[PDB]
């Protein structure tokens, strides 16, 4: 899709392998913010969003949590607390065969900057000048949607770049997108390191009498500490207590 | 039952007296909470979550449908049929103090911004207040109007001749022009498409028409 009207695909309830994307040689850029690219097969997320669009080569640096410019302000905004990765690669053999326009448009003019993950499609005429035309086009009144001119082999840095950005949702309903990890057996009444689909800790697990409602997975004791957890394969209600310690 | 599809559907879900419901549309999630309590009374009851519906759409207005046990299925009549009252309330961003019992069921709740006594209960984080004076919050007289007082100059100082000069200087012996006593518009420069770089340090490029400076070089 164009820079504006960027695609938004929802991914959930799957086993996600991120080593296939990182090992890909085509990807020219694979910046990851808030997460380590190597430590991505060990995590668990609730929802993953993939946004695909094509931009100009010099314009890739604007796809970052705290950058500014035409794209960041008017086309695609990333929140400063971004937790995800941006994947971009050069595609001059598919988007610049002839003319390169291929309905690749962007937004030069807008009244104000965008909010994070906000889209803005409008045929309204922008008034960049003194005279309030209040009509369509004319002098000092322009159409915001300007097309990309992708002349075949117009020098590196102006060639089309296809960008796919992934956003990882966290702190929500039980995670549905998880890495390719083989679950092991359940060990109780022993000081063991447990890994309950994202929640990592060390302690001893015992049978609990807590009556979770059928929609609660976690449990917080006083001082906001996680003391109870639900097994994601048998729905068992397990009690977590710290291992013995002292001076 | 009269309906249609219009071939633009992108989701589907089929599954299986006082009825209370809460419809909340946040972050693309349409959460519905429900409770089936036998019997608006004075009691307290909590609404368990019912469905998540993880797709979500933009919602601003809504309707309500009613049915009949055994009557005609005419899809055009407005008042025909047998000769069911429901209540509507609007959610607000309010602060609550919920009480969980030993079984984890919410037994009572206190609305913080309702009464001074409720504010005291919320501040103490307890449902019982002893005798005495408690300091709850602060009081401020909110502003009633906004005024702006800028000097009257009313002349555009020449950013144009700085940029459209027929011959710039070398890297060394760089030019130095002083600009003062003018009305400066910075939206003309930022909106310029030619500018490849427009980095701003110490100031926001959008928040430049609202400021005032003594000298610009």
């Amino acid at each position, epitope marked *: 899709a164009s820079v504006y009207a960027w695609n938004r695909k929802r991914i959930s309830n799957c086993v996600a392998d991120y080593s296939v994307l990182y090992n890909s040689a085509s990807f020219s850029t694979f910046k990851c913010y808030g997460v380590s690219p190597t430590k991505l097969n060990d995590l668990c997320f609730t929802n993953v969003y993939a946004d695909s669009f094509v931009i100009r080569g010099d314009e890739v640096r604007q796809i970052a949590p705290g950058q500014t410019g035409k794209i960041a302000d008017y086309n695609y905004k990333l929140p400063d607390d971004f937790t995800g990765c941006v994947i971009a690669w050069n595609s001059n053999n598919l988007d610049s065969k*002839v*003319g390169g*326009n*291929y309905n690749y*448009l962007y937004r*030069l*003019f807008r009244k104000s900057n965008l909010k994070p993950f906000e889209r803005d499609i409008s*045929t309204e005429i922008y008034q*960049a*000048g003194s*005279t309030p*035309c209040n*009509g*369509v*086009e*004319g*002098f000092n009144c*322009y*159409f915001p*949607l*300007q*097309s990309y*001119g992708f*002349q075949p082999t117009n020098g590196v840095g102006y060639q089309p770049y296809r960008v796919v950005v992934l956003s990882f949702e966290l702190l929500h309903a039980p995670a549905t997108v998880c890495g390719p990890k083989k679950s092991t057996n359940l060990v109780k009444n022993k000081c063991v390191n447990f890994n309950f689909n994202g929640l990592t800790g060390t302690g001893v697990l015992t049978e609990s009498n807590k009556k979770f409602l059928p929609f609660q997975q976690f449990g917080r004791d006083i001082a906001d500490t996680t003391d109870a957890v639900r097994d994601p394969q048998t729905l068992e209600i397990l009690d977590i207590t710290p291992c013995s310690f002292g001076g | 039952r009269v309906y249609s599809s219009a071939n633009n559907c992108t989701f589907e879900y089929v599954s299986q007296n006082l009825r209370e419901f809460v419809f909340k549309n946040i972050d693309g999630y349409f959460k519905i909470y429900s409770k089936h309590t036998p019997i608006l009374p004075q009691g307290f009851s909590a609404l368990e979550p019912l469905v998540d519906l993880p797709i979500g759409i933009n919602i601003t207005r809504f309707q309500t449908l009613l049915a009949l046990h055994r009557s005609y299925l005419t899809p055009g009549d407005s008042s025909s049929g047998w000769t069911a009252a429901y209540y509507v309330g609007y959610l607000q961003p309010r602060t609550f103090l919920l009480k969980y019992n030993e079984n984890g069921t919410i037994t009572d709740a206190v609305d913080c911004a309702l009464d001074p006594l409720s504010e005291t209960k919320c501040t103490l984080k307890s449902f019982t207040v002893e005798k005495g004076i408690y300091q709850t919050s602060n009081f401020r007289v909110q502003p009633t109007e906004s005024i702006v007082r800028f000097p009257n100059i009313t002349n555009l100082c020449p950013f*144009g001749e700085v*940029f*459209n000069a027929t011959r710039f200087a070398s890297v060394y012996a760089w030019n130095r022009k002083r600009i003062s006593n003018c009305v400066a518009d910075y939206s*003309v*420069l930022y*909106n*310029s*498409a*030619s500018f490849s770089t427009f980095k701003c340090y110490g100031v926001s490029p959008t928040k430049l028409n609202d400021l005032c400076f003594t000298n610009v070089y």
Partner: antibody
Amino acid sequence: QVQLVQSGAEVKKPGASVKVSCKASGYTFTGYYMHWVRQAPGQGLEWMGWINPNSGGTNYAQKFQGWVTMTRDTSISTAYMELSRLRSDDTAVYYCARGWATYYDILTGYSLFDYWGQGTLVTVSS
Amino acid sequence: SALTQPASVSGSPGQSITISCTGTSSDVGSYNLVSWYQQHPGKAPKLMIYEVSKRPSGVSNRFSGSKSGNTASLTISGLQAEDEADYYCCSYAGSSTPHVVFGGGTKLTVLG
């Protein structure tokens, strides 16, 4: 550098419709307005309209509303003008001309009709 | 419609010749986007003055233009044999009706 190519000379009969195409090269086709003008043999110049290559927005003169349609195929960088209900009084020469920039810019001026094409000689008669 | 322009102008070599172009308030009195074009016989018009006086590349310093009131003037001094061509005046019209108009034309016959 900049060069514009029109269609071949048009020969038609009254009551029909004609299409005039301007194919440009040597510049970013969607960076400047494209203007359509007409000129009677031996008379003064006249203006038809302009087209904004970006979306297809059209503006027409007061006396040429109803039988003037402005389109363009940007994939091959061509601008199309459609004339309907042709009459013998419209036998003239038509030019495709380049306007100012479709984008706001301070380092650019407002040189209207900077570049013209060869033109199409349309001849309609019985 | 158009702008009133003198139909015939005759100029001997060595003198200054001024061509007028009278318009309306919303045509020339507000938008300084007037232009002048020289049309050689049998050749498409070539841009001469894009705005009031400022000139494009390939245009001699002899040529000049000015704006006053609701009219504009194009000044040529020291005519040459290449000046035997038609001259046209154009401007941009706004006021809720964005369009442009042309002039009545002028035939210049250089002597010598």
